[PDB]
Short mmCIF file of all heavy atoms in Angstrom, two decimals:
data_model
loop_
_atom_site.label_atom_id
_atom_site.label_comp_id
_atom_site.label_asym_id
_atom_site.label_seq_id
_atom_site.Cartn_x
_atom_site.Cartn_y
_atom_site.Cartn_z
N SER A 326 -30.68 -13.38 -1.40
CA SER A 326 -30.54 -14.82 -1.67
C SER A 326 -31.05 -15.09 -3.06
O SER A 326 -32.04 -14.50 -3.46
CB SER A 326 -31.24 -15.64 -0.63
OG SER A 326 -32.62 -15.35 -0.56
N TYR A 327 -30.45 -16.06 -3.76
CA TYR A 327 -30.87 -16.40 -5.10
C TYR A 327 -30.51 -17.80 -5.52
O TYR A 327 -29.68 -18.46 -4.89
CB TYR A 327 -30.28 -15.35 -6.12
CG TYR A 327 -28.78 -15.31 -6.19
CD1 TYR A 327 -28.14 -15.76 -7.34
CD2 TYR A 327 -28.03 -14.89 -5.13
CE1 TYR A 327 -26.74 -15.76 -7.44
CE2 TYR A 327 -26.62 -14.86 -5.19
CZ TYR A 327 -25.99 -15.30 -6.36
OH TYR A 327 -24.61 -15.28 -6.44
N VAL A 328 -31.11 -18.28 -6.62
CA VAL A 328 -30.86 -19.58 -7.16
C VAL A 328 -30.07 -19.53 -8.50
O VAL A 328 -29.19 -20.30 -8.71
CB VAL A 328 -32.21 -20.35 -7.40
CG1 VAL A 328 -31.94 -21.69 -8.01
CG2 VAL A 328 -32.92 -20.51 -6.07
N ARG A 329 -30.46 -18.60 -9.32
CA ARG A 329 -29.78 -18.36 -10.61
C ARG A 329 -29.75 -16.88 -10.89
O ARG A 329 -30.41 -16.08 -10.19
CB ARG A 329 -30.44 -19.11 -11.73
CG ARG A 329 -30.16 -20.62 -11.73
CD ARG A 329 -28.65 -20.92 -11.92
NE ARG A 329 -28.17 -20.67 -13.25
CZ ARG A 329 -27.35 -19.63 -13.63
NH1 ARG A 329 -26.94 -18.79 -12.71
NH2 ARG A 329 -26.97 -19.50 -14.89
N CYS A 330 -28.91 -16.48 -11.87
CA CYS A 330 -28.84 -15.11 -12.25
C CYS A 330 -28.35 -15.04 -13.71
O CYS A 330 -28.23 -16.05 -14.34
CB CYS A 330 -27.85 -14.33 -11.33
SG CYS A 330 -26.15 -15.00 -11.43
N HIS A 331 -28.11 -13.84 -14.22
CA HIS A 331 -27.68 -13.66 -15.59
C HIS A 331 -26.28 -14.23 -15.90
O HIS A 331 -25.90 -14.35 -17.04
CB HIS A 331 -27.72 -12.15 -15.98
CG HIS A 331 -26.80 -11.33 -15.05
ND1 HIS A 331 -27.05 -11.20 -13.70
CD2 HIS A 331 -25.68 -10.62 -15.29
CE1 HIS A 331 -26.11 -10.43 -13.17
NE2 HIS A 331 -25.28 -10.08 -14.14
N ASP A 332 -25.58 -14.56 -14.81
CA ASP A 332 -24.24 -15.11 -14.97
C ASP A 332 -24.17 -16.60 -14.78
O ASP A 332 -25.15 -17.20 -14.38
CB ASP A 332 -23.28 -14.44 -13.99
CG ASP A 332 -22.91 -13.02 -14.38
OD1 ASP A 332 -22.73 -12.78 -15.60
OD2 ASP A 332 -22.82 -12.19 -13.46
N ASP A 333 -23.03 -17.19 -15.06
CA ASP A 333 -22.81 -18.62 -14.91
C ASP A 333 -22.66 -18.85 -13.38
O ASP A 333 -22.43 -17.87 -12.66
CB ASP A 333 -21.54 -19.06 -15.60
CG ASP A 333 -20.32 -18.21 -15.18
OD1 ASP A 333 -20.37 -16.99 -15.36
OD2 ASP A 333 -19.36 -18.81 -14.68
N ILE A 334 -22.79 -20.10 -12.97
CA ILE A 334 -22.60 -20.40 -11.54
C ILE A 334 -21.09 -20.53 -11.30
O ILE A 334 -20.42 -21.39 -11.87
CB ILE A 334 -23.26 -21.75 -11.18
CG1 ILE A 334 -24.78 -21.65 -11.40
CG2 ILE A 334 -22.95 -22.09 -9.74
CD1 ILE A 334 -25.52 -22.97 -11.06
N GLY A 335 -20.57 -19.72 -10.44
CA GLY A 335 -19.15 -19.70 -10.13
C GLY A 335 -18.86 -20.59 -8.93
O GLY A 335 -18.84 -20.12 -7.76
N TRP A 336 -18.65 -21.87 -9.19
CA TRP A 336 -18.34 -22.85 -8.09
C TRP A 336 -17.20 -22.51 -7.18
O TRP A 336 -17.20 -22.93 -6.02
CB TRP A 336 -18.11 -24.23 -8.72
CG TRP A 336 -19.20 -24.64 -9.72
CD1 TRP A 336 -19.11 -24.72 -11.06
CD2 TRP A 336 -20.50 -25.00 -9.35
NE1 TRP A 336 -20.30 -25.14 -11.57
CE2 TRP A 336 -21.19 -25.29 -10.57
CE3 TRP A 336 -21.24 -25.13 -8.15
CZ2 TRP A 336 -22.55 -25.72 -10.59
CZ3 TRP A 336 -22.55 -25.53 -8.20
CH2 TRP A 336 -23.20 -25.81 -9.41
N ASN A 337 -16.23 -21.78 -7.70
CA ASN A 337 -15.07 -21.43 -6.86
C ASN A 337 -15.35 -20.75 -5.57
O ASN A 337 -14.54 -20.79 -4.66
CB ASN A 337 -14.10 -20.54 -7.69
CG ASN A 337 -13.26 -21.36 -8.75
OD1 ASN A 337 -12.47 -20.77 -9.43
ND2 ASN A 337 -13.50 -22.67 -8.73
N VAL A 338 -16.50 -20.06 -5.42
CA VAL A 338 -16.84 -19.43 -4.19
C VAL A 338 -16.93 -20.42 -3.06
O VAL A 338 -16.85 -20.05 -1.89
CB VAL A 338 -18.18 -18.66 -4.27
CG1 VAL A 338 -18.06 -17.44 -5.21
CG2 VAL A 338 -19.28 -19.59 -4.74
N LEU A 339 -17.11 -21.70 -3.41
CA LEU A 339 -17.23 -22.78 -2.37
C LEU A 339 -15.93 -23.44 -2.11
O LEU A 339 -15.92 -24.46 -1.35
CB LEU A 339 -18.27 -23.81 -2.78
CG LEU A 339 -19.76 -23.56 -2.62
CD1 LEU A 339 -20.54 -24.82 -2.90
CD2 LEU A 339 -20.06 -23.11 -1.18
N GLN A 340 -14.84 -22.97 -2.66
CA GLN A 340 -13.53 -23.62 -2.43
C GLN A 340 -13.29 -23.99 -0.96
O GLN A 340 -12.83 -25.11 -0.67
CB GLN A 340 -12.39 -22.71 -2.91
CG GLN A 340 -11.24 -23.50 -3.49
CD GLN A 340 -11.67 -24.39 -4.65
OE1 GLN A 340 -12.14 -23.87 -5.68
NE2 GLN A 340 -11.54 -25.68 -4.55
N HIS A 341 -13.58 -23.07 -0.05
CA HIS A 341 -13.39 -23.31 1.38
C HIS A 341 -14.22 -24.47 1.87
O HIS A 341 -13.69 -25.46 2.45
CB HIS A 341 -13.72 -22.07 2.19
CG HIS A 341 -13.53 -22.24 3.68
ND1 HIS A 341 -12.32 -22.60 4.26
CD2 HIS A 341 -14.45 -22.15 4.67
CE1 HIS A 341 -12.51 -22.69 5.54
NE2 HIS A 341 -13.74 -22.41 5.83
N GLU A 342 -15.55 -24.39 1.67
CA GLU A 342 -16.44 -25.44 2.16
C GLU A 342 -16.09 -26.80 1.57
O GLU A 342 -16.05 -27.81 2.22
CB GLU A 342 -17.88 -25.09 1.81
CG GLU A 342 -18.54 -24.02 2.69
CD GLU A 342 -17.96 -22.64 2.37
OE1 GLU A 342 -17.54 -22.38 1.23
OE2 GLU A 342 -18.03 -21.78 3.28
N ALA A 343 -15.78 -26.82 0.24
CA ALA A 343 -15.45 -28.06 -0.45
C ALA A 343 -14.31 -28.82 0.22
O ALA A 343 -14.17 -30.03 0.02
CB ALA A 343 -15.07 -27.74 -1.90
N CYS A 344 -13.50 -28.15 1.01
CA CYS A 344 -12.39 -28.80 1.70
C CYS A 344 -12.93 -29.61 2.92
O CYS A 344 -12.22 -30.40 3.52
CB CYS A 344 -11.37 -27.78 2.20
SG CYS A 344 -10.47 -26.97 0.86
N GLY A 345 -14.19 -29.37 3.27
CA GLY A 345 -14.81 -30.04 4.35
C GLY A 345 -14.31 -29.62 5.74
O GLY A 345 -13.30 -28.91 5.85
N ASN A 346 -15.00 -30.06 6.78
CA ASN A 346 -14.61 -29.71 8.13
C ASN A 346 -15.02 -30.87 9.08
O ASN A 346 -15.38 -31.96 8.59
CB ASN A 346 -15.18 -28.39 8.60
CG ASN A 346 -16.67 -28.31 8.37
OD1 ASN A 346 -17.43 -29.30 8.46
ND2 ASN A 346 -17.15 -27.12 8.20
N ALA A 347 -15.02 -30.66 10.40
CA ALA A 347 -15.34 -31.70 11.35
C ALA A 347 -16.75 -32.22 11.20
O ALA A 347 -17.02 -33.36 11.62
CB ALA A 347 -15.12 -31.18 12.76
N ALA A 348 -17.67 -31.44 10.67
CA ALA A 348 -19.04 -31.87 10.56
C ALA A 348 -19.45 -32.29 9.14
O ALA A 348 -20.37 -33.04 8.91
CB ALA A 348 -19.99 -30.80 11.05
N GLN A 349 -18.72 -31.72 8.16
CA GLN A 349 -19.03 -32.03 6.78
C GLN A 349 -17.83 -32.51 6.00
O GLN A 349 -16.82 -31.78 5.82
CB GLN A 349 -19.58 -30.70 6.10
CG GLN A 349 -19.86 -30.85 4.61
CD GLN A 349 -19.21 -29.77 3.82
OE1 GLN A 349 -19.68 -28.60 3.83
NE2 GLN A 349 -18.10 -30.05 3.14
N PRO A 350 -17.85 -33.80 5.54
CA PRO A 350 -16.72 -34.30 4.76
C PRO A 350 -16.53 -33.47 3.50
O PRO A 350 -17.43 -32.78 3.08
CB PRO A 350 -17.20 -35.74 4.45
CG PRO A 350 -18.06 -36.11 5.60
CD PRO A 350 -18.86 -34.81 5.82
N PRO A 351 -15.32 -33.56 2.92
CA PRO A 351 -15.05 -32.76 1.72
C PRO A 351 -15.96 -33.21 0.54
O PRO A 351 -16.57 -34.26 0.58
CB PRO A 351 -13.59 -33.08 1.41
CG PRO A 351 -13.02 -33.56 2.74
CD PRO A 351 -14.17 -34.34 3.31
N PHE A 352 -16.02 -32.36 -0.52
CA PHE A 352 -16.80 -32.74 -1.67
C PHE A 352 -16.05 -32.12 -2.89
O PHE A 352 -15.34 -31.10 -2.74
CB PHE A 352 -18.26 -32.29 -1.64
CG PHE A 352 -18.46 -30.81 -1.48
CD1 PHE A 352 -18.70 -30.01 -2.58
CD2 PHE A 352 -18.47 -30.22 -0.20
CE1 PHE A 352 -18.95 -28.63 -2.39
CE2 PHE A 352 -18.73 -28.85 -0.02
CZ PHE A 352 -18.98 -28.05 -1.17
#
């Protein structure tokens, strides 16, 4: 687990979650 690293933050890994679900609205 980590907070930052030598690379940029790749937001795309959250594409699925960002679509939201029954418990979490999209973002």
Side-chain angles (χ1 to χ4, degrees):
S326 59
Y327 62 112
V328 176
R329 283 299 287 108
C330 62
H331 58 296
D332 287 320
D333 53 302
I334 297 180
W336 308 109
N337 283 179
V338 292
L339 280 188
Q340 214 59 62
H341 179 60
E342 286 71 27
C344 292
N346 52 31
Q349 178 230 285
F352 60 96

